[PDB]
Design a protein around this ligand. Sequence first.
Ligand SMILES: *c1cc(O)ccc1O
Ligand SMILES: *c1cc(O)ccc1O
Ligand SMILES: *c1cc(O)ccc1O
Ligand SMILES: *c1cc(O)ccc1O
Ligand code: NI
Ligand code: NI
Ligand code: NI
Ligand code: NI
Ligand SMILES: [O-]
Ligand SMILES: [O-]
Lengths: 122, 570, 570, 100, 100, 100
Amino acid sequence: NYIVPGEYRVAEGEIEINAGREKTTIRVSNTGDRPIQVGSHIHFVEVNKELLFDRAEGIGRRLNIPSGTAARFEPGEEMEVELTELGGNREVFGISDLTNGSVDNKELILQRAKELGYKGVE
Amino acid sequence: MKINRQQYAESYGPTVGDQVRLADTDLWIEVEKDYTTYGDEANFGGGKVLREGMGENGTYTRTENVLDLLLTNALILDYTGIYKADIGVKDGYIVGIGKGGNPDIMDGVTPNMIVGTATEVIAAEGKIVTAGGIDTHVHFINPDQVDVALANGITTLFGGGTGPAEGSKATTVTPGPWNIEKMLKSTEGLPINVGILGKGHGSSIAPIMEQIDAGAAGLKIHEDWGATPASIDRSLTVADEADVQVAIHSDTLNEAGFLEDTLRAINGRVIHSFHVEGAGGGHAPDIMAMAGHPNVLPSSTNPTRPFTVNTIDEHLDMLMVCHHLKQNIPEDVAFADSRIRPETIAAEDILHDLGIISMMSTDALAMGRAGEMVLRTWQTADKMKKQRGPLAEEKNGSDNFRAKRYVSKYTINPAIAQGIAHEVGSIEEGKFADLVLWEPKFFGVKADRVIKGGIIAYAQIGDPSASIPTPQPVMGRRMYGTVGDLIHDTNITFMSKSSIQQGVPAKLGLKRRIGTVKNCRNIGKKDMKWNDVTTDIDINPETYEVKVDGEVLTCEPVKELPMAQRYFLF
Amino acid sequence: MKINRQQYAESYGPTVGDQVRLADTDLWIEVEKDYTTYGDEANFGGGKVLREGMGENGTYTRTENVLDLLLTNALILDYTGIYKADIGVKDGYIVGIGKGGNPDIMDGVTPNMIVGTATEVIAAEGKIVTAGGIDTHVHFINPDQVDVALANGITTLFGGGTGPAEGSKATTVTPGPWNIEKMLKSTEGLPINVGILGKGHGSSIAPIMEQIDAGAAGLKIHEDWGATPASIDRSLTVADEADVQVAIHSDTLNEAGFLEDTLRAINGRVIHSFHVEGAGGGHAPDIMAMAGHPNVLPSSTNPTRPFTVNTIDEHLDMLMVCHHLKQNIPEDVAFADSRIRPETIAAEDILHDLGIISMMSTDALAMGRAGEMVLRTWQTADKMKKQRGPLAEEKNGSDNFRAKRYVSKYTINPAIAQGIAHEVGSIEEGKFADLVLWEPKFFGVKADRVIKGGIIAYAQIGDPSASIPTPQPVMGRRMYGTVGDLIHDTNITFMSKSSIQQGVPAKLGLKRRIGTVKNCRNIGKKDMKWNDVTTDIDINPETYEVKVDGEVLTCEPVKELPMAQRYFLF
Amino acid sequence: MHLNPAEKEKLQIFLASELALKRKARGLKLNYPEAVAIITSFIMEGARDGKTVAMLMEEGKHVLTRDDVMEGVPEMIDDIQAEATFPDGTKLVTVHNPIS
Amino acid sequence: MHLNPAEKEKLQIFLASELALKRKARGLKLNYPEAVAIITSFIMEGARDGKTVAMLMEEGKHVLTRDDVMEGVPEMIDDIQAEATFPDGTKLVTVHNPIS
Amino acid sequence: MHLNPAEKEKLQIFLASELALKRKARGLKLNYPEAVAIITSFIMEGARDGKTVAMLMEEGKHVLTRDDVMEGVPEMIDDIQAEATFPDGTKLVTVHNPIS
Ligand SMILES: *c1cc(O)ccc1O
Ligand SMILES: *c1cc(O)ccc1O
Ligand SMILES: *c1cc(O)ccc1O
Ligand SMILES: *c1cc(O)ccc1O
Ligand code: NI
Ligand code: NI
Ligand code: NI
Ligand code: NI
Ligand SMILES: [O-]
Ligand SMILES: [O-]
């Protein structure tokens, strides 16, 4: 019975994020010499060119981390990250201009990625 | 991936089943449902979600389902529920309650709640969001009173007054066409919504009616102008024709009638009974019996709320001094004793808890405090929890039922009473975006940010010369919504249909939004949300004891309240 | 008859070859030339020269070459020179710099600088007169910020914001047509010039462009809304079409690209790089390399200016707390370490001195101080004199060269960048009469009188109830220029050509002078006055050391500054 | 701090009361606004201490006496009113004829 | 004096701090705005004395302890921020969890 | 109290003077606004005491000396002006070169 004004009394449990969507783990490496931090909702295939990973596995996906957080890659760092699937209409516009439409156009996204020099187009 | 519930709440505000303490009271509200999709919560900042191509859509123009403003992760406290949602605003109105973001990539986005290029963001995670308070008993006495009201989350003032003239100091009346026009013009510079009551006194219709045509939004009958059977009758006749509300402060002296006489003059027509307990005025000693009738919309004023050990001493003396009542004149003593009654004040606390008194209000600067309607509503709720216990209809150890009953008394119910709930009084889609954000630690005490018409009008913010807005001194200040011409779009002047039809605003050059008063004559006690109880209230004329359903209503005053010395510098 | 030089200066202000100390710094400016005729100096008062038939002409009507206002004996400090002249104003504009008086009897009178019946006088003998400061990085968060800016001689605010909403608290953005309209209306009540930036974010042109048509004067790209390649590109495409400037706070996180990616997206188009050193945001750690490019117009914000012993501690902590960055999360620590860098902050001091960073600005209320752009410009100049010595190009032991380089950073250069230097930003004939008078003892610290559109808007003046205006308390106060409708004629709302052509001001009822934004797309670094250096800047990604022309740039922080504890009550 | 408008204004009374107390300490008979300030501030500080409205109604009559003030001051002051936050909320105190 | 707008406002904090210190001296547990005022004013006066931002970051945690304030006050105050003029210009001090 | 506008403003000077005196007491050399405040408040309090304009013109030159203030302050202050209510009404006092 000490009163903390405005305190919470949260219920029991835990909140599962992105429930029901496919998960995928990939290895990713910052081949550049400066740090790269990536947010929860950026279409993963469109991140910094100098991140080397299998770019196809970023298509239609984003990081499976809580909304508003980010993964950090120090220079030269390689680590595994977990992805989840984009929802809604599964369309991406802008960002790096690799998609501009349905994320189903895998070929087209990868061709654009490779011409612009995004690493790991396999 | 799972997030524990303490962390979730700390980052995104609470979710289903979490509870939150209302300031330093014993009252806990519980999140009833949550419109989000876990993992797709909206938030704004560096590396956060509302960014172009991600949670912000880059494709759509403002007309295409995009919001002007999104309040993210708000804990809404309203008569319609206690729940978690994003709130979307456009053209100064609430257009969506649900889930905001970008349907390109997010599941569950309410279709008209797209965050686009046109969208501003207010982070409400960790805040309680309520409708702005609707104060229906305001004396327009001193313009500094407006900021006082905004600081405690009030956003609509209905009342009357021309400044500190004796008429205005005693009554919520702006009398006649000329004074009403003058105050409508004054109102162009007040950063809050306003409606003006004319004088509900006369024995011919025309002197009264011409105030409604001039721009009044209603009428006040006050004993100081003659709360006679004739004035009551003519006022209600005008009101039934004009579709505006009438408020009454009845004949305390019983000079032309007792309570039953006043009720006969009213004759079943709709009326708002002001400070119904009677300390603030009315048929001695039984005025509070008004609150059991189906045609009465009953409100309290705030200085009796709640009953405390200092309440009587303060009132006896307030009364004696304001009415030049001499301590050695026994008529004055008897008058004061017949009016200030622990029995009815104690009972008023209980009537509020039982949903029998439907409304709170201030009585600002004429026997009430402009900035304490909200404050004292919650102090009263807390006192009743302490003395009576959780109400029968509570679940899960929360106080949501009581929270809804009480928040209704200063948001939706006054709106309904006044004929303005089509515009204001709750957080519902289609209504004007008058919203108050509160830190739960300051809830009901000091508003964090007050939004008027979709733009911030008032805020507790710090040093304007600092690198960031938080350094001291943090104080209530007027924001851009109150500046220049923006004061016109962010506030409503409420007026009668006939004034509006006769072109009054153009005549006067009013540039404020004009709100129509309507649907006041066809309502009753049964239309007051969560406060719809009718019953036989008996007040014993010898002992002043109050009975309801043959049960005597007694209660103790308290020595201490929450939302008091922990918070205030004086 | 001859007057000695100390007496001359004491009576008429300094003349050719005299020097003056800038507040309590070590900086001395020297009068370069003097437009007067010795013996015919203008002055006003009992038995003085500006009297009918004498230095005041009694014959001519106002249309006939007569001034509305003459500032007598001003020491002008401007990018165009440091020199002594009378300044003549008419219709709210500077129409003559030269010698004012009466050609009936005086030699050397500039022909349109006649003092007539219509002429007001401001005595500027003994004052330094500058153009009003042009702050291009303003967050509109708290309206009290305006007086803060005026008190330090700022007269134009460009930026964005809707009050203390999170969007606005983080970014200089007023998003979309509706919010932009609302802030244009708000602006009718702000006594300072204003231009509003829209949101520079989107993947289609239309959502962005419609802000320019609504009234924006430019755009801001901010990482918090997604400073992605697409948003940069679409913004610059809109800007090249609309003829407005774009400001950028780039992707600090390097999420979608490194600096060279941002430069590729920009693709040689003109852009204003905000807080280019990077403490205030941008590609970690090498953003400051933007400042060597020919298409970049580089500005600093003020909290890094200059480098002091408290600078880092204050910033590390400011950052950690504003971004909810936890001390035990190593990503947050690493983030904070990659962003707050003594190496680049030290180097920024030197870049300013070398004319490589062209502009100062505040970043008011979102990582910068509204009232310290001017203050800190001069503190930086003084620190560099102390550590580096007089610059090579100085003559006569004066600091005029450095004074011109530095005054340009907050007057003419921001104006040029924003496309508004046809109206404001310097003391030149044909420009709006925004002028600041300073006592040399208070120079850069507290403005004596701030003139807006030819009428005093703000002044350090005393007790309004006194027999004269000097008794205590002397404090900054708003003057008649800010009152009533005069606020409209004394201030400019800057807007896009297209908004102006589409009748936006009439649509909204704006009564302020409307200024056109133009000629922003055809300029570069080479157009920044006295600050036009392009070069290869290298920032070592491991050590963060800064090189220019293969020379490493290091500098020491200082423990004490001028224009600080001698002047301020807190 | 989150100061509301009355909090801001009421700081002035305290400040005036301090000024007036310093003047009394140096031997001056107090004037009308001085007297009013001292009594008002005494009431507000009493409420802060947790006294009752009744206590302050009594005490307020004995804060200053006629020999503390100038001629006519006692008669100019018919009463003094203040609101402050008591442990049980804001309440109004009226002190009648505070200086006899 | 040439007071600018922040100078004017900041005088209020000092004044509130004096009020709050007088209340503490008479034995009261301090409330939320009182506590905030005392700590803020301590920071500004420290800067005036020529202390460093780091010193005030440390010291600011030991100006008031939990037994100086009412129940819940320590927990209401997550940090306190102030700007003042140091010998090297205006700087921002943030004191986290000033009362433990 | 019936405070008029100048009464309100002038309370600030008193408050600044108190701040500045507290700073001097802890050993600081006073700055420009501090110095001005102390001297101004001294003049106003003198008038309240019933001194003459001539007395305050003299005395005002000996309230602070150069070793009370920072370098350059004496030279920044050419005079100081204040109005206050004397026993014979409001009058203006000007102190020339108050710190020598
Ligand atoms: C004074 C004025 C009122 O309006 C009421 C009561 C007193 O004492
Ligand atoms: C008040 C009301 C009740 O119903 C019970 C007890 C008190 O004090
Ligand atoms: C608070 C508010 C901001 O806008 C920035 C930083 C803090 O701590
Ligand atoms: C800074 C810059 C220089 O050029 C020399 C010395 C310091 O400290
Ligand atoms: Ni009444
Ligand atoms: Ni009333
Ligand atoms: Ni920025
Ligand atoms: Ni910024
Ligand atoms: O009333
Ligand atoms: O910024």
